[model samples]
Target: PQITLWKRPLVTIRIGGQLKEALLDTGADDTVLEEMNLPGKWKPKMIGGIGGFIKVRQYDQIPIEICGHKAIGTVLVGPTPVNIIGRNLLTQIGCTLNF
Candidate 1:
């Protein structure tokens, strides 16, 4: 399914069996969540954005449900103001810009 690009294309998604909202950000390369109680091992990583760099937990091959589409990939957990679903998972969900 196609999603229109608004000022901020926000969508509802499920992560770690929890329902959450995230911004479908084509600008970001990786998915980032505000914070979650994720299981398993995660490596320490840093990510940069308009707010500068932040330390995050990088978990690999995590399952995420985006708009009813299931995808497994890397997800970063950190102190982000909003959740972000990036291209890594967007392409898997067949999400594209419909101008």
Candidate 2:
């Protein structure tokens, strides 16, 4: 039997608007920051035409550098995405998608 071993890789992203350390996720569709209290924080804008958009008007966007090794695009402020990594990140790394 052939088995594959993973290094349990992880990346860190700033959470909320305070630049907090957050666990890097490889199973989230997009980087998500939990809704919390912060100064000058704006409510989440309603997202349309998307599959999973939250109705809650909370959360704030924060800047996060993926382990300071690579740059990740803007982080959306809203409910966390389900257990699935966004293809954007994987594709950037030239990873093959297998069904």
Candidate 3:
């Protein structure tokens, strides 16, 4: 689907049998999600992006589907904001920022 830059590039995502709206952040390197208790053993990850670095829980090999496209990779979670589907995962999917 074609999207406009006038609005946020967020779409519905499914993980752990649950669903929510997440951002298709082309600028982010890794995914960062809100606290959703996705079943997995996670470790503290130091995230440095957009000049702000913070520690968040990192879960690897977690299955996820964004608008029906499936991928399993590192999904970060913490006490902060939006669910970001970064280029690390977007590159796994079929997104490459087309005009």
Candidate 4:
């Protein structure tokens, strides 16, 4: 779906059979989601954000459905104010900003 830039691009995403809202963030390199429990093993990782650097759990080969489009990639779980669907997944979903 085509999204306008007037407001933050928030979309419905399905993970672990649970639906959640996340923002399509083009500036971020990795997908960052609010703390949540996911199946499979995860690794400890540190990533930087607009606010600052934070330690997060990195899960790989995770499958997520964004607005009905399915994508499998790395998802970072951390204490973020809002879930961010970064370029990594956005690219998978073919999201682009145009003027």
Cα lDDT computed for each candidate against the true fold: 0.91, 0.42, 0.85, 0.90
The local lDDT score (0 to 100) that residue 87 gets in candidate 4 is: 90
Please provide, for model 1 over 7-59, each residue's C-alpha lDDT reduced to its tens digit, 9 standing for 90 to 100. 67788899887999899988899999998889999999999989799999999
Backbone steric clashes in candidate 3, count: 0
For residue 90, model 4's alpha carbon misses the true position, in angstroms, by: 0.9
CA error at residue 30 for candidate 3, angstroms: 0.1
Give the alpha carbon lDDT tens digit for every residue of 35-64 in model 4.
998889999999996678888999998999
Worst 10 residues of 2 by lDDT: 1-10
lDDT tens readout by residue for model 2, 23-80: 3344554544455454555555654325755643433333334444344443445454
TM-score of model 3 vs. true structure:
0.89
| Model 1 weakest 10-residue run by lDDT | 1-10
Candidate 3 ranges with C-alpha deviation above 4 Å:
none
Model 1 scores a C-alpha lDDT of 0.91
Of 2 and 4, the candidate ranking higher by TM-score: 4
Please list the residue runs of candidate 1 whose C-alpha ends up more than 4 Å from where it truly belongs after superposition.
Answer: none
